[PDB]
């Protein structure tokens, strides 16, 4: 008898797939609630770079959901 995984165990599962900088960016943007620029400053890249990485992360995430 198996326990349905919680949001974090699940999301965590899906995060391991992401490159570490993309994962770091989603966390800052969503969990801390940093903006694109603030995230850029905290991570050392530019704002454009964050906007691309966070987008790629989101898509990657959408994909991985499909399989399963």
């Amino acid at each position: 008898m198996a326990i349905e995984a919680d949001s974090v165990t699940r999301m965590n599962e899906l995060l391991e797939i992401l490159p570490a900088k993309q994962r770091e960016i989603l966390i800052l943007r969503v969990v801390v609630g940093l903006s694109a620029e603030e995230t850029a400053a905290a991570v050392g890249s530019t704002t454009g770079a964050v906007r691309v990485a966070q987008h790629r992360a989101l898509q990657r995430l959408k994909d991985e959901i499909v399989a399963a």
Binding site: D6, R29, L58
Partner: protein
């Protein structure tokens, strides 16, 4: 144009971050946003 892709993700993440509930056309979007919100909550939750 691809440039609107970026703007749109940025806006989605900005809404997620402010805990704003958004209604998506594609239910899979809805599902993912929901999943992220719950995760956002748990991880903020000390």
């Amino acid at each position: 144009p691809p440039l609107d892709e970026l703007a749109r993700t940025d806006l989605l993440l900005d809404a997620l971050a402010e805990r704003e509930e958004v209604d998506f056309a594609d239910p899979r979007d809805d599902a993912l946003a929901a999943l992220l919100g719950q995760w956002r909550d748990d991880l903020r939750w000390p």
